[PDB]
Amino acid sequence: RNLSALKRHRQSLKRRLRNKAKKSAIKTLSKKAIQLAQEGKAEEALKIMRKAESLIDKAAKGSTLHKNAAARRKSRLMRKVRQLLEAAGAPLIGGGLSA
Amino acid sequence: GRYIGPVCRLCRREGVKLYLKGERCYSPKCAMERRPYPPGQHGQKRARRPSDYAVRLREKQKLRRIYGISERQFRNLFEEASKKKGVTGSVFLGLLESRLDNVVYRLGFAVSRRQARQLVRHGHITVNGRRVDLPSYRVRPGDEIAVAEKSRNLELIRQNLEAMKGRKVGPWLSLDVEGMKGKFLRLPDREDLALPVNEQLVIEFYSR
Amino acid sequence: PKKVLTGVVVSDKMQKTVTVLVERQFPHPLYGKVIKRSKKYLAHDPEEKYKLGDVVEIIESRPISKRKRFRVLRLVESGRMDLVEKYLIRRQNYESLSK
Amino acid sequence: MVKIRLARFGSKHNPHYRIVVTDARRKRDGKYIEKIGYYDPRKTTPDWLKVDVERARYWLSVGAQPTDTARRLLRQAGVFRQE
Amino acid sequence: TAYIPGEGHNLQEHSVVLIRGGRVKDLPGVRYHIVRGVYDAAGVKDRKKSRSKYGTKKPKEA
RNA sequence: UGGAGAGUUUGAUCCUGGCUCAGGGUGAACGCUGGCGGCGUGCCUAAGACAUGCAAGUCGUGCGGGCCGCGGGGUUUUACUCCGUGGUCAGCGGCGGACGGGUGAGUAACGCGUGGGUGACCUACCCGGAAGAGGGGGACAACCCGGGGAAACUCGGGCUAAUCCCCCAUGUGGACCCGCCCCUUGGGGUGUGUCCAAAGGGCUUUGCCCGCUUCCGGAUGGGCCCGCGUCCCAUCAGCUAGUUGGUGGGGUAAUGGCCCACCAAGGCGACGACGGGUAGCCGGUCUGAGAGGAUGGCCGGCCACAGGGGCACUGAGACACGGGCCCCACUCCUACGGGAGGCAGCAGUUAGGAAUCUUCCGCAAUGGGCGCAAGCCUGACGGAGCGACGCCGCUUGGAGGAAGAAGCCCUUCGGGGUGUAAACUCCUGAACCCGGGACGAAACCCCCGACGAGGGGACUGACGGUACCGGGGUAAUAGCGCCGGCCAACUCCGUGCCAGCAGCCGCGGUAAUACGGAGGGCGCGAGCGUUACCCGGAUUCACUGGGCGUAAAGGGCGUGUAGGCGGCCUGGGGCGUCCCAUGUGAAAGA
Ligand SMILES: [Mg+2]
Ligand SMILES: [Mg+2]
Ligand SMILES: [Mg+2]
Ligand SMILES: [Mg+2]
Ligand SMILES: [Mg+2]
Ligand SMILES: [Mg+2]
Ligand SMILES: [Mg+2]
Ligand SMILES: [Mg+2]
Ligand SMILES: [Mg+2]
Ligand SMILES: [Mg+2]
Ligand SMILES: [Mg+2]
Ligand SMILES: [Mg+2]
Ligand SMILES: [Mg+2]
Ligand SMILES: [Mg+2]
Ligand SMILES: [Mg+2]
Ligand SMILES: [Mg+2]
Ligand SMILES: [Mg+2]
Ligand SMILES: [Mg+2]
């Protein structure tokens, strides 16, 4: 009756939560940042972007994201942050993104 | 296979003296001498003129009966000849004649081709020193065909190699009666065999 | 190599796309006659530079839409409205084949 | 990874392998990248182990692992000896 | 419908039968033969010549 | 190096023309008959349903426990069961379960084939190279406790270890925005900003072995895209709303209406859209003179599917054949509370069927997964078994033996046939029995060397006491179809449009070479016939290679669209075309 692919199942479930956590975190922060960039709040927009960047990259490390995927996430975040800001802006918290 | 059953009864029907018993089919006996007509209740009746088919059927059957070879083996042997290089008729004979059972008869280690079969098959023949018992075995130019050392002095073998002192063995072969060895030198030319068989009609048999 | 094909622009009703009709000729596999078949290709024209009648090299490309996998390479010659008229007559004749 | 290994050819009670390089994940008798030697474990002929050494070395140098049994046979034709 | 070849037979209303294919130039709409010697179709008794059609066992030469 | 035709429409003829046959072939089936071996090959139907066993695991050199057998003495020992090692058990953690194996249901499609593209991408383990492995924390099972259960086991509370999780650091390097240079679809570089690493285990230990992290390159395997090729019906002619395109997003490794907002109104179709029907596609295979036609079982490659349908998770990879969720269908256990299941893996059962095998042996080999290794696992595989299913080989005797026994058949009552066939004499010696007995197996490992090269040693065989060799040794299975013509092979009896035959012409009405039997013959022969299906013959769909006055066939006639085809001369181009080189055309097959 029994195979211990059951194990693999038990395990997939743990990782499934692990990655869910990192992923939903990455979107709440990415959203938050673009939202602040649009309000024009650039110290906190960039503040958050950095956090998001970190968490995306942290995620690239194992199975959760990888690759061009994180890079992409990052790319779109700072493409979207830098521009919303630029409409008003000045990149206050000089942190996060190239001069 | 090899038929098994009355022979100098197709020594007849083909109407032409094959040599299936070797020695008797030379006495006032191969029935070609006595009853040169087909077997059976008819046989000595008006011959109805043969269909083009029967002409060839008979020619084909003649040749085959000469070597004592199954039709499946024969057709195969023939189809091989056709694919092979140059004149299918001549080549095909050479392949028939390259057979071990027949080589052994041509050496006169045996009286008849039936006999040769039985000798080969019973371990009495050896090719290049190792013993062969496959009548169908193909003999190649340059092969020593001898009589097995243990068989060397058997009643039948001494009788048969006693008669080979005197005789000439076909040009494409060599023989060493004292030491009971033979050599297949080359493939038989179409003329080296005086066959009572127009092989060109046999090719035509298989064309249908 | 990227496949280059040449042919005429028979439609520019779309935005940044031209429909390019390519004639080609092969011997018939059995009967040997040279036959002439034709295919239409939607071709990216990002600078709406090409107009109806333009004969154009078409080049194989990174997909640009479903359907579009060919960019316009260059302009062989211009205003061949004769080849355009031909195709449209062939198309208009269909109206007279139904029930 | 990619492998140097014995592909079985010949026939029943007639093993005749090909020394072949192939993704490990192919079936044994399947498609392979390249043939390099052949091997006849019963030495029914004198030329019963052959190997193209200069190719086996290319393949070893780009990270093909050989089978134990394959290694043994490349060794035997001196793929491994270096003077 | 199906022809029952052979002199004599033993087929009746629920006899099981092997059908064969082969029509009969003579009975219209008889496209099939019955295979004698199989299921409930008996062989043909006393048959001695074309014995393997007609599903007849080789008779004993006591 | 390659090509045969014949019968049948007439009183007879020529032509037309259909029907029919001889040949080859098959995963075959059925009938009669059957001796051996070798190599192949065997559910073509119900992608119906399946009892039972086995088909995927492995690491104690990742980690902490439970249990046991020992060593070594704790109270001297059985009651507090303590250290060391070698077993086992689950658990946690890895790597594998995406390969291998099955099947052909769906699919008419970039599915496949073939050639290309990716400046639009990924690739665990393997290799080469560079630089790291420095700090800290934490939780979940196991385990104990309790509630729950008939059990499966299930919940709660608490303990805990690591190569489990998490933060911090270093940043060789890498990612990302932006600017600059080069390059030209997103390719390479560079600057500042931000953001990102890691794991320990084992030994004979200031050295080795296995692992961990980041980057670059390689190799291998992939994804996506495009040209061309890919069945029948037009009594299916119009099709289309994410539909065609754009913009901006989302998504992915990556392009893309893949998905979503918005805008535009497109896109496709007689060069056959759409629809319906059928079908997995190819290397090949069968047939054929070829061109073609048919096919795609076995073996190889690609695709699809895993009771039907949808779905995602984990992950280098899956939308997962022996993983998961839900719906549906069906079945099973049940204490009626609930549980369990998916052979198109190997065998096997059952049903359906004309019909298709052992619930076999072994991991010795080759290959695969895990492991430092020993080794474990492997119904992949190697073998054995059964089946004349197929092909190849072999036997059932050989030489002698009468103008020719007997029997049986014919008879013109002299004969003739079976028939050298038998009897009979010699000879050989399938089977048998005796003795001996393989290759396939040398590696991994061990020792010298350095755990490299190189040298030396040890183990290992399912098949198998088999193949084969040696020695003895018995005359030792033969049947099936046909004998009117095509078609090779004829007489007698029985029968009398009956019984029956039959592929076509047609045979059968009392002298039947055509029915049934006999003798005799012809053809094959452990087979011979039958039925079915494919090609041939069929130049009867005709490219090769046909036709339409009367045989079937000129549209009732114009006009004309698409299309097809296009006089003479000169030049440019070089698409067709031809040439050369070169790449590709896998292996197997030929
Ligand atoms: Mg939220
Ligand atoms: Mg008959
Ligand atoms: Mg008439
Ligand atoms: Mg039987
Ligand atoms: Mg393609
Ligand atoms: Mg986009
Ligand atoms: Mg994915
Ligand atoms: Mg189908
Ligand atoms: Mg032809
Ligand atoms: Mg099923
Ligand atoms: Mg299963
Ligand atoms: Mg049944
Ligand atoms: Mg034809
Ligand atoms: Mg005609
Ligand atoms: Mg008329
Ligand atoms: Mg007419
Ligand atoms: Mg007219
Ligand atoms: Mg015109």
Curated annotation (Swiss-Prot), chain A:
<dbReference type="Pfam" id="PF01649">
    <property type="entry name" value="Ribosomal_S20p"/>
</dbReference>
<dbReference type="InterPro" id="IPR036510">
    <property type="entry name" value="Ribosomal_bS20_sf"/>
</dbReference>
<comment type="similarity">
    <text>Belongs to the bacterial ribosomal protein bS20 family.</text>
</comment>
<keyword id="KW-0699">rRNA-binding</keyword>
<keyword id="KW-0694">RNA-binding</keyword>
<dbReference type="GO" id="GO:0015935">
    <property type="term" value="C:small ribosomal subunit"/>
</dbReference>
<comment type="subunit">
    <text>Part of the 30S ribosomal subunit.</text>
</comment>
<dbReference type="GO" id="GO:0003735">
    <property type="term" value="F:structural constituent of ribosome"/>
</dbReference>
<dbReference type="InterPro" id="IPR002583">
    <property type="entry name" value="Ribosomal_bS20"/>
</dbReference>
<dbReference type="GO" id="GO:0006412">
    <property type="term" value="P:translation"/>
</dbReference>
<feature type="region of interest" description="Disordered">
    <location>
        <begin position="1"/>
        <end position="25"/>
    </location>
</feature>
<dbReference type="GO" id="GO:0070181">
    <property type="term" value="F:small ribosomal subunit rRNA binding"/>
</dbReference>
Swiss-Prot record, chain B:
<keyword id="KW-0479">Metal-binding</keyword>
<dbReference type="InterPro" id="IPR005709">
    <property type="entry name" value="Ribosomal_uS4_bac-type"/>
</dbReference>
<dbReference type="GO" id="GO:0003735">
    <property type="term" value="F:structural constituent of ribosome"/>
</dbReference>
<feature type="binding site">
    <location>
        <position position="11"/>
    </location>
    <ligand>
        <name>Zn(2+)</name>
    </ligand>
</feature>
<dbReference type="InterPro" id="IPR002942">
    <property type="entry name" value="S4_RNA-bd"/>
</dbReference>
<protein>
    <recommendedName>
        <fullName>Small ribosomal subunit protein uS4</fullName>
    </recommendedName>
</protein>
<dbReference type="InterPro" id="IPR001912">
    <property type="entry name" value="Ribosomal_uS4_N"/>
</dbReference>
<comment type="function">
    <text>One of the primary rRNA binding proteins, it binds directly to 16S rRNA where it helps nucleate assembly of the body and platform of the 30S subunit. Binds mRNA in the 70S ribosome, positioning it for translation.</text>
</comment>
<keyword id="KW-0687">Ribonucleoprotein</keyword>
<dbReference type="InterPro" id="IPR022801">
    <property type="entry name" value="Ribosomal_uS4"/>
</dbReference>
<keyword id="KW-0694">RNA-binding</keyword>
<keyword id="KW-0862">Zinc</keyword>
Curated annotation (Swiss-Prot), chain C:
<dbReference type="GO" id="GO:0019843">
    <property type="term" value="F:rRNA binding"/>
</dbReference>
<keyword id="KW-0699">rRNA-binding</keyword>
<comment type="subunit">
    <text>Part of the 30S ribosomal subunit. Contacts protein S12.</text>
</comment>
<dbReference type="InterPro" id="IPR012340">
    <property type="entry name" value="NA-bd_OB-fold"/>
</dbReference>
<dbReference type="InterPro" id="IPR019984">
    <property type="entry name" value="Ribosomal_uS17_bact/chlr"/>
</dbReference>
<dbReference type="InterPro" id="IPR019979">
    <property type="entry name" value="Ribosomal_uS17_CS"/>
</dbReference>
<dbReference type="Pfam" id="PF00366">
    <property type="entry name" value="Ribosomal_S17"/>
</dbReference>
<comment type="function">
    <text>One of the primary rRNA binding proteins, it binds directly to 16S rRNA where it helps nucleate assembly of the platform and body of the 30S subunit by bringing together and stabilizing interactions between several different RNA helices. The combined cluster of proteins S8, S12 and S17 appears to hold together the shoulder and platform of the 30S subunit.</text>
</comment>
<dbReference type="InterPro" id="IPR000266">
    <property type="entry name" value="Ribosomal_uS17"/>
</dbReference>
<dbReference type="GO" id="GO:0022627">
    <property type="term" value="C:cytosolic small ribosomal subunit"/>
</dbReference>
<keyword id="KW-0689">Ribosomal protein</keyword>
<keyword id="KW-0694">RNA-binding</keyword>
Swiss-Prot record, chain E:
<feature type="compositionally biased region" description="Basic residues">
    <location>
        <begin position="46"/>
        <end position="57"/>
    </location>
</feature>
<comment type="similarity">
    <text>Belongs to the universal ribosomal protein uS12 family.</text>
</comment>
<comment type="subunit">
    <text>Part of the 30S ribosomal subunit. Contacts proteins S8 and S17. Interacts with IF1 in the 30S initiation complex.</text>
</comment>
<protein>
    <recommendedName>
        <fullName>Small ribosomal subunit protein uS12</fullName>
    </recommendedName>
</protein>
<comment type="function">
    <text>Interacts with and stabilizes bases of the 16S rRNA that are involved in tRNA selection in the A site and with the mRNA backbone. Located at the interface of the 30S and 50S subunits, it traverses the body of the 30S subunit contacting proteins on the other side and probably holding the rRNA structure together. The combined cluster of proteins S8, S12 and S17 appears to hold together the shoulder and platform of the 30S subunit.</text>
</comment>
<feature type="modified residue" description="3-methylthioaspartic acid">
    <location>
        <position position="26"/>
    </location>
</feature>
<feature type="region of interest" description="Disordered">
    <location>
        <begin position="43"/>
        <end position="62"/>
    </location>
</feature>
<comment type="function">
    <text>With S4 and S5 plays an important role in translational accuracy.</text>
</comment>
